[PDB]
Amino acid sequence: LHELKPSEGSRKTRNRVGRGIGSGNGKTAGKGHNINRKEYAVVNLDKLNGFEVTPELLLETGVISKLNAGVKILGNGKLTVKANKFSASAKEAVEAA
Amino acid sequence: PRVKGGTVTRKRRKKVLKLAKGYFGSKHTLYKVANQQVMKSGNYAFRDRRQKKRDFRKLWITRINAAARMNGLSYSRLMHGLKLSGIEVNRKMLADLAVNDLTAFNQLADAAKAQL
Amino acid sequence: PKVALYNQASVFGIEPNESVVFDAILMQRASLRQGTHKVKNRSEVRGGGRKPGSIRSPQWRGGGVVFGPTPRSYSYKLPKKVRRLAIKSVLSSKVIDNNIIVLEDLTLDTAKTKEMAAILKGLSVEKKALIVTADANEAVALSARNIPGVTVVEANGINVLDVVNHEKLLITKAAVEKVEEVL
RNA sequence: UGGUUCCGCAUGGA
RNA sequence: AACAGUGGUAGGAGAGCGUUCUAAGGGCUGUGAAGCCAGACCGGAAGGACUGGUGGAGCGCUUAGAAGUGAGAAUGCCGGU
RNA sequence: GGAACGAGGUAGAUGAAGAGGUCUGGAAAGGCCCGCCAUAGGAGGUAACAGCCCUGUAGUCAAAACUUCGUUCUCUCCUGAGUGGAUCCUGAGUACGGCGGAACAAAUUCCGUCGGAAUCCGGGAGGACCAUCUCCCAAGGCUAAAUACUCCCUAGUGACCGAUAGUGAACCAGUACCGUGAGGGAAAGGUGAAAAGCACCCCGGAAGGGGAGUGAAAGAGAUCCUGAAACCGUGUGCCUACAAGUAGUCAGAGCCCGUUAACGGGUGAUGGCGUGCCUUUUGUAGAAUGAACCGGCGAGUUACGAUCUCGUGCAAGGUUAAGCAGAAGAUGCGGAGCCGCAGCGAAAGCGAGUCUGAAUAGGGCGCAUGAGUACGUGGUCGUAGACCCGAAACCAGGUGA
Numbered sequence: 039l040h041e042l043k044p045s046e047g048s049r050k051t052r053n054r055v056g057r058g059i060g061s062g063n064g065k066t067a068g069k070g071h072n073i074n075r076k077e078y079a080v081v082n083l084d085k086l087n088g089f090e091v092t093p094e095l096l097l098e099t100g101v102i103s104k105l106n107a108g109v110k111i112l113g114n115g116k117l118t119v120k121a122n123k124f125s126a127s128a129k130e131a132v133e134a135a
Numbered sequence: 136p137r138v139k140g141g142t143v144t145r146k147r148r149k150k151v152l153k154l155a156k157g158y159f160g161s162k163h164t165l166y167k168v169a170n171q172q173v174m175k176s177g178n179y180a181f182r183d184r185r186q187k188k189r190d191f192r193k194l195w196i197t198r199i200n201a202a203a204r205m206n207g208l209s210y211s212r213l214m215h216g217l218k219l220s221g222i223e224v225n226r227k228m229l230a231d232l233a234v235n236d237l238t239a240f241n242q243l244a245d246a247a248k249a250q251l
Numbered sequence: 252p253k254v255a256l257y258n259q260a261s262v263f264g265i266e267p268n269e270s271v272v273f274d275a276i277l278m279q280r281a282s283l284r285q286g287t288h289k290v291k292n293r294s295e296v297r298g299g300g301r302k303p304g305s306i307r308s309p310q311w312r313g314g315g316v317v318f319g320p321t322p323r324s325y326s327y328k329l330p331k332k333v334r335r336l337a338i339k340s341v342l343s344s345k346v347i348d349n350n351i352i353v354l355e356d357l358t359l360d361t362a363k364t365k366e367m368a369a370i371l372k373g374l375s376v377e378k379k380a381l382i383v384t385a386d387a388n389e390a391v392a393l394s395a396r397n398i399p400g401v402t403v404v405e406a407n408g409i410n411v412l413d414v415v416n417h418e419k420l421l422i423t424k425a426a427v428e429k430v431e432e433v434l
Numbered sequence: 435u436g437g438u439u440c441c442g443c444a445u446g447g448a
Numbered sequence: 449a450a451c452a453g454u455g456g457u458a459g460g461a462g463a464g465c466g467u468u469c470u471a472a473g474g475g476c477u478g479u480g481a482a483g484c485c486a487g488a489c490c491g492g493a494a495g496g497a498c499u500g501g502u503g504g505a506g507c508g509c510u511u512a513g514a515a516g517u518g519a520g521a522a523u524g525c526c527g528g529u
Numbered sequence: 530g531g532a533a534c535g536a537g538g539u540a541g542a543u544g545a546a547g548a549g550g551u552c553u554g555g556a557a558a559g560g561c562c563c564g565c566c567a568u569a570g571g572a573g574g575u576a577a578c579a580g581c582c583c584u585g586u587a588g589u590c591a592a593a594a595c596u597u598c599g600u601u602c603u604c605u606c607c608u609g610a611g612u613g614g615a616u617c618c619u620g621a622g623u624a625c626g627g628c629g630g631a632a633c634a635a636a637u638u639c640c641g642u643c644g645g646a647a648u649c650c651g652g653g654a655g656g657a658c659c660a661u662c663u664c665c666c667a668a669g670g671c672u673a674a675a676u677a678c679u680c681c682c683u684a685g686u687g688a689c690c691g692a693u694a695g696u697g698a699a700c701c702a703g704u705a706c707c708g709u710g711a712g713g714g715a716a717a718g719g720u721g722a723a724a725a726g727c728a729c730c731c732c733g734g735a736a737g738g739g740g741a742g743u744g745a746a747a748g749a750g751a752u753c754c755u756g757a758a759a760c761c762g763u764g765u766g767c768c769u770a771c772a773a774g775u776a777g778u779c780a781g782a783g784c785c786c787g788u789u790a791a792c793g794g795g796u797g798a799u800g801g802c803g804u805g806c807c808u809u810u811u812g813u814a815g816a817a818u819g820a821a822c823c824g825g826c827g828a829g830u831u832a833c834g835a836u837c838u839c840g841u842g843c844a845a846g847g848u849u850a851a852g853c854a855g856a857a858g859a860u861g862c863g864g865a866g867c868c869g870c871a872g873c874g875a876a877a878g879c880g881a882g883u884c885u886g887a888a889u890a891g892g893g894c895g896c897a898u899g900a901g902u903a904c905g906u907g908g909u910c911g912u913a914g915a916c917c918c919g920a921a922a923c924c925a926g927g928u929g930a
Contacts, residue, residue, distance in 0.1 A: 039415040042512040045270045137516045138468045179778040288689040410859045
């Protein structure tokens, strides 16, 4: 605590104006002379690869931040789910595995 | 905080009013007109470190030109033959500081007509 | 790290922070600043509206200052992750140079400050120090407050400052088990 | 001006 | 270590010195501290240091965060001449 | 409508330990070598910087008389309801229409302005609003708490100011002055530890001096600490009465001096060169603007929002707000939120697929190739007085024949 030296490149002296002729900017101080619409966000298919794939526990794992209406499963990535809305790609991907 | 700052202005104005020590009239008391004749007296003293480099030349030439008229030669005739026969690269200063000693100058003056 | 204490593996290890450690100390100085400085203005000066432009102006000696500091308060915050990863690091400086000293139970009977001077003589601690005890031992807190160098700390109320200033730390072992639980 | 399952306030309509 | 280069306003970028303050330490002061006046010293600049007189209660230094700013110009304002 | 038991508030009481020894000084609270107290080393005085010198603090207890809260008693009071809606009730100039205002297609609010109703089968609303369905009962009246703010009054803290500051005002200040009046509105702190504030002598009418005394200091003698600069002087080394100069600058004898010892210091007869400073302009020497001089004061960053760079933590997951606990503090505890991991129409829908589109063709967008995010420093750009300084006018309330 005697010599608390801050990290290099973390602080910079504040620029002044009118405090020197050779310092710059002193004379003129450098100033010249629908209604309802549901949204299921984006449920990536690669986010479930880390793992009873329900939305109740999906929001507690970090996969789902906000809870809007229901929950749709997209088949963007490649890997017992009981939700509601499921994309065609995901459905086929879930049945293929 | 609030910073009055009285101890920092006079020590910034003594060091100007010390460099004016010896001027005429009011120009060594009033700070408002001692700052001009310090900012100008550093400006002449740069301009006149180039003239005394070039106006000692017109001294040494005028003395050599008189010391060459003892032998009929002018300055242009002398320096022309001082580089031909003789291989010396003697300064126009040190070919002038020996003007007092006639014997010395004469010796070097004899070589001027040797290749002329 | 476990020795024979004193009878008169994740907290303090290695890999000191540094940049983050300094950040925590910078945010502990601003808060402590009370910040109650106010100055007048050109408008809140008991001044005239007519031309004598106006008798209380920025250039006038009777008027106030142009800018000037107004009633403000600077209170920033680190994240929660950067608020518990530094208290270990200042602890970790102390496991290096043996500045930690561990005692059992901080044995006291009354509030005699003559005992603590014998205890500081006994542990051979000289300058400012710390005392951390988990249960708010009232004989400890009522003592030693008058002894000028030292201070006692209820173990939850540790913070990144007093470990740096007081530079050595008389700890009861009963408080060591508590401090991993919060962090 | 007029084309057109354009939408349509707990459930039907304009 | 050889070359290459160094006029410069608007304007852009970079590196520095100072002025008060509250603390982690460290240390001078009644055998005389700030402030004041001298000086023929030191540093590339802003600026520092040492002797001598005057003063009769305090100051200062590498180290970190903040600075009611560091003035020669306002047909500036108050005082003095 | 009363009476006891507690906590307070306004007065105080009590309170631990060194003349340590020695040095310098006018004077130890300093040094130097020692001792001691602490539920107490918070402050303030003391002839210099005190824990133990006092006034006090931490601690404990204190109020006759007032009041301020409560706990307890006195005291005071007083039905809850089983089934039936057979018959009555449930808030009348109102619920509502026309006309016109206002202020939150157009209700709405709310007044006038004339019309104007039924009512448990009921009644009301669910955007000028039409049919199903839920929720709830208009036109009776009262209601603490958590909040807003201080002229005040106690206790205290300031990365607040220290006499051109801070309030206008540290001082017999809203005073003195100015104005008929409403109103405007200053200037001005400091002897000394102590008043010990000059017995007496001398000149003078006295003021003011010189001695003498006091004092550590009279260079401290009443606008009295320190006492700068402009301005005014008196001495003294070197120059100056044939000389045309932004006053200086290089060269330079002579002459006088001795230093933070250094290719010294001060003057300079004479030769060379040399159109002040700042602002502004295509451009300066200008008569283009500004300054009598000295000193003081005097002009770009503050939380709120945008955007980028840098630093740092975690990283396809990052982050808490308000608030409650704890010296107005860090710190916990708080997962309500926000931001991100993916898109297109003037009006609706899947998901690596489109909006306009017979179209499996051209044009649309975006990924493939994926890092944000929470703070912090600085950069600009904003909104508010927003570089500082500076008009004429306009309105509201007032004062004057």
